[PDB]
């Protein structure tokens, strides 16, 4: 993973959560539950699908080819002919194939990079009032109920509240 | 004690995708962009069936092969469809000159109106009944050409031909005709009496004189001598003016060309098949969403883009493990 | 309390920029890359002047048709500029031989030099001054192409000419020359006397033997006969023969070409701009330091490369909210 | 953004930096003001600069279009030439349009990148002497004069000083 | 640097290390010297030589040119023959000198990224442990013996050990 | 105090590749996938040897020019070297017939076996042995094209010629044959009698009449006559008949097609060189690894994928300082 969170320091993926690509697991008095970050998620579509939208559109006027016929004494034409489409053909393949692969690494990427930057909208508020684990978590030095979850999730995340 | 954490979602697909740096990533959600399924027919095209020759060439249709007669009048169609190798083609055995570019032209063609401008009553002073051959056999009997009449001498006079057809029609005419190659100088006045001939024809824009070529040749379909065929395009208002003292192969039958448009010769063994589609291949039909195939380059229709590919898939979720 | 930040630019710019993944990105500084602006005039290309043919074809021009006079003597050209449809070409119905191949040629010259290699005076045995139709008329009275010669019967005798032309200049010889295909065996003996003729014409390299096609044709500038027109580039050193007992359309004037070069035949029916360019296209001429531009395909001179694009812009500087 | 700086956890650009496309403001005693790190700044304009002449001259052998003709019987030929032409035609705009599509959001990601890096630089030299605020600066544990943010700037900070 | 390590926090290169293209270098008691990071320089093998084949693999159906021949009067197949061979070998030399510009500038940032990725999965693992120089080196806040500096490198650092 | 650092490899390689926004960025490890040598000679293609005309032409050759005797029986190929400009091609002045459409044909042929259809000792009614010029010396004495034989009138008598050869080899045959253009009525009298004469040439697929054309030319090589030659590919158990009262070039030697494969004709002004290639490129062959190759794109063999890039480098390492 390019951005190294990922299959990173954030070892596996959530079955659990359904709602969207990338969220949030809390534990708190008040149960556990897991939780999309539409923002980012809606974000992630939006990009994944103008991707698609656009590869596709790029090559609608690729190279259609058309039926041509030459007699016993006009082998030239018809060879050129034939390796003119075959060229097209060819290098219309090596075109899609390699946006294909191109892009396909760049989306993976592009997922990773949006769990970093969450986890880092995230540790960016939270900062002294509770700790980094290590594997994407954050232990509290505080009581965080929904309320505050919700804050945290929303990145309105009032600090000023203690620890020790 | 209280802890939040940050993740991403994970599934159960196993649907792969290849990377640059990697081949056969496993991802939570993928798009396939690429069809690889027809249904091995040929249907018609928007409601508009395709013209199949089964037997037949270009060639044979429009001279009129008598082993060909399920094609002497023809509705509008979609696209042709025609064998890699027709049996039914020049049974009187010859040449065609320009056929392809003649195939060319039924590409922007979509109807043809098949009428009578000479008829073959019409001859007087020539045989117009005795052109046939074991070549071109019809039910067991020596026949010929439909479209083209085979004239000869008659009481042992052949008098020069001056014959004219205007185009009154608001259509270009595909006018067909052609000359007889004898194989001597004996069977050349037996025919035609006059042992040196020539035909002669005239438009606004044609201006060619045909001999004939005595020679000795290999038999084919029984017969050394041979059928060189001509065409034109006969403008509306315009004339053909034909002169000829013997070997001249006349028009009896041409084609209005009634509709132009987006047509196409389809290469192709299969038969026509009962089912309609917006895409054609010449191995079957595609009914797709998907913006390639790898099917076959020759498509007519509303199609996806032709690629060289076996296999083309998007990434758009994230990997899985 | 002091403290220190880090940040990046931003402005009032509203440039945008597309992306794979966003569409009408603003950014803060951005390069436009493509032309899309031109003058709507044909120019001069690095000071020398194209050649305008203006309702002429180049057949009407290198064979002299009365209605091209403008023509009749040409100074060195960048390129040539032809309309779609030239109304000035074969005011004698007929045709050009190779004219595709031809015109191909004249997109690798810049100058022709006209000289008289065969003097209209120097036929002495023949008619040289009745060659004229009514399907060429200048000011009113039937004239005909200026550099080719339509020879006729002189006393009720059309001898044989024999006639040579030895190519003694240093360029390379552009020669025209023609037959007569009359309409009837009346005509050509009415024309020519010889009810059988023939026109051989003979180089190092050449070797042809033109003989006369009778034939009934439709009308074209009142006339059913026809003018079928040869050409031969002759080989400084080399010399062109002609033999003929009649239907010849000889020779008068040549073209030398003088210079070669990067030339080009475009098709506009703009007419000429007292106008100077480094780049020209058939819709007008472009002045960009623009690397790509999507006006015309069809280019001379040092200009940008032509893309099929309406939008071609590339981030230089970053978002911008 | 690909690496979470601009528009991420620094909210908004400066219209007040007009020195550069990256670089600082400061706010001690002896006033408060906007600076352009001059080395990420040309760095980046060497980078981007060299990626237009290099997408330029990429495309400086293309493929120009010459005029032929045919007559009425060579529409096959015509067929084939004009095809072709549209066929170069259609491979050339699609790899200008590919290519400014894609070396544009690396563009994007590449001053991202820069903001990011040139963030991480002056963290990495205050360490304790300064909090992380989570917009980009640094509240300050002691008093850093002129000369000190220029140390900071230069890279050449003396952690050697001290806090609480 | 895209990722700001090599050439960013991390002056410069070891020549030292000879195992691999990423590692770590220990000073302890015991001693000192290098080690490579083999599972991040195997991935990063893995990942060259795939992209190298893969560049290779896409180009290998190109457009090889055949030799025809024409007279006098077929100047124009000729010339619409060179301009189609002449095109394809453009588009050809395009693409491959495009994909090695674009997969070399991938292949850098891809060693970048390898790079802080591994600074982050030893400093994720330090935590309060060790101090963060700035340079790429932790300076310890107990005694790290071989035993302990291998289980930083294969990510099996028992946290629980105090400090100060 | 114990500390552990992090850090990446580096060396002493100064091997350079560029990016998009950075060019010569030096790297620890980097791949050359560029092959630019050669060595400068043309050798055999995986042992098969290939055909060098040296200073003779693909017609030389094939028509028997005296001064191209090294090639009278040529063993297997594996690709034909040409040069430029061959010197020796047809002595005697005149053309080939679809010369181009041959060539291309030996592209696809890898063997030639040549054998004698119809022996010069054969023509009993006609000269066979006075068929000469000193437009084809060979050593000194007039000589002529081996594998056609240029007849003449014997005793004042020119019959007409009626010959059939029946192609009864499992493989096709090329046939070679010609006409004599005389340069006046003379000449053509006091070579075959008759004023007026023909050549004919029938196949199941051929049917040409051949007439000669009188002209008055300029000399090359001596010589204003000219000689015209045709082929065909006769099909096993197909015959070709050939009648003719004068001006025939009947063929005597023809080539049966042994060998179908893939070959090739090369321009190259390089001769043989002793060697063995997998890749052979018309100014040397290539012996590589490497993907791709920048030294000639007309290419035989297994060979590298040409490119007209003058370096091409691929990073494996990183930056190193
Ligand atoms: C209109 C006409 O005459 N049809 C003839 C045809 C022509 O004579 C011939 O094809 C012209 O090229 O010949 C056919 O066979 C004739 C056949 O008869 C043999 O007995 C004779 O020995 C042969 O030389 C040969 O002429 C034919 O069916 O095509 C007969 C046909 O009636
Ligand atoms: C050199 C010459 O004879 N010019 C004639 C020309 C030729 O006869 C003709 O074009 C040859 O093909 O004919 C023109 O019109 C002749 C016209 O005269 C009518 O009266 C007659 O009934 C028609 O048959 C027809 O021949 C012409 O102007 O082109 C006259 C010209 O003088
Ligand atoms: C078979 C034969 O007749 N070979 C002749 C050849 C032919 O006559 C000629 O090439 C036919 O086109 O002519 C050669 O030169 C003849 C030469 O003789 C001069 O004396 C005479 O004045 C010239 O007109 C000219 O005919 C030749 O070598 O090719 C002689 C050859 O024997
Ligand atoms: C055909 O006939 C019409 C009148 O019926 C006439 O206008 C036209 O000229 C004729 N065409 C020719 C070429 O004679
Ligand atoms: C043309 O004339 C010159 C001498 O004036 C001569 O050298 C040359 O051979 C002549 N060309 C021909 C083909 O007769
Ligand atoms: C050639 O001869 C064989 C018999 O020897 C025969 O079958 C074949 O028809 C002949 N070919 C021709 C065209 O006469």
Redesign the interface.
Same mark, same amino acid.
């Given at each position: 993973?390019? @951005? *190294?969170?990922?299959?990173?320091? #954030?070892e596996?993926?959530?079955?659990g959560?359904?709602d969207?690509?990338?969220?949030?697991?809390?534990? $708190?008095?008040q149960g556990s539950g897991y939780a999309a970050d539409k923002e980012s998620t809606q974000k992630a579509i939006?990009?994944?699908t103008?991707?698609?939208n /656009?590869? #596709?559109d790029?090559?609608?006027?690729?190279?259609?080819?058309?039926? +041509?016929?030459?007699?016993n004494?006009?082998? +030239?034409?018809e $060879?050129?002919?034939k390796?003119?489409?075959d060229?097209? =053909?060819?290098?219309?393949?090596?075109?899609?194939?390699? =946006?294909?692969?191109?892009?396909?690494? +760049?989306?993976?990427?592009?997922?990773? /990079?949006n769990?970093?930057?969450?986890?880092?909208?995230?540790r960016?508020?939270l +900062?002294d009032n509770?700790?980094?684990?290590?594997? *994407? %978590? @954050?232990?509290?030095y505080?009581? %965080?109920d929904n309320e505050c979850?919700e804050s945290?999730r929303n990145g309105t995340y009032n600090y000023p509240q203690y620890s020790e | 004690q209280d802890q939040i954490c940050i993740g991403y979602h994970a599934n159960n697909s196993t649907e792969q995708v290849d990377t640059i740096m990697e081949k056969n990533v496993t991802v939570t959600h993928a798009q396939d962009i690429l069809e690889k399924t027809h249904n091995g027919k040929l249907c018609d095209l928007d409601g508009v069936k395709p013209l199949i020759l089964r037997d037949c060439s270009v060639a044979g249709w429009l001279l009129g092969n008598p082993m060909c007669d399920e094609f002497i009048n023809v509705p509008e169609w979609s696209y042709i469809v025609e064998k890699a190798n027709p049996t039914n083609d020049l049974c009187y055995p010859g040449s065609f000159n320009d056929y392809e570019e003649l195939k060319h032209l039924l590409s922007r063609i979509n109807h043809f109106e098949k009428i009578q401008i000479i008829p073959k009553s019409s001859w007087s002073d020539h045989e117009a009944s005795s052109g046939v051959s074991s070549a071109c056999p019809y039910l067991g009997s020596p026949s010929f050409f439909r479209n083209v009449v085979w004239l000869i001498k008659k009481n042992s006079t052949y008098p020069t031909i001056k014959k004219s057809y205007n185009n009154t029609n608001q259509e270009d005419l595909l006018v067909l005709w052609g000359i007889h190659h004898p194989n001597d100088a004996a069977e050349q006045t037996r025919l035609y009496q006059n042992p040196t001939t020539y035909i002669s024809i005239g438009t606004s824009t044609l201006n060619q004189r045909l001999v004939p070529k005595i020679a000795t040749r290999s038999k084919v379909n029984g017969q050394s001598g041979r059928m060189e065929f001509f065409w034109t395009i006969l403008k509306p208002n315009d004339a053909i003016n034909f002169e000829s003292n013997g070997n001249f192969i006349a028009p009896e039958y041409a084609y209005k060309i009634v509709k132009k448009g987006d047509s196409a010769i389809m290469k192709s063994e299969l038969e026509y098949g009962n089912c309609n589609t917006k895409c054609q291949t010449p191995m079957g039909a595609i009914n797709s969403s998907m913006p390639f195939h790898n099917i076959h380059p020759l498509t007519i229709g509303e199609c996806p883009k032709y690629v060289k590919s076996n296999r083309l898939v998007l990434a758009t979720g994230l990997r899985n493990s």
């Open positions: 993973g390019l @951005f *190294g969170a990922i299959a990173g320091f #954030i596996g993926g959530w079955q959560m359904v969207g690509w990338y969220g949030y697991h809390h534990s $708190n008095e939006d990009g994944v103008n991707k698609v /656009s590869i #596709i790029k090559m609608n006027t690729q190279f259609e080819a058309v039926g +041509r016929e030459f007699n004494l006009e082998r +030239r034409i $060879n050129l002919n390796k003119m489409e060229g097209f =053909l060819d290098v219309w393949t090596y075109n899609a194939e390699l =946006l294909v692969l191109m892009e396909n690494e +760049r989306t993976l990427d592009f997922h990773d /990079s769990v970093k930057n969450l986890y880092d909208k995230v960016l508020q +900062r509770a700790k980094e684990l290590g594997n *994407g %978590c @954050f232990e509290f505080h009581k %965080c979850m945290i | -």
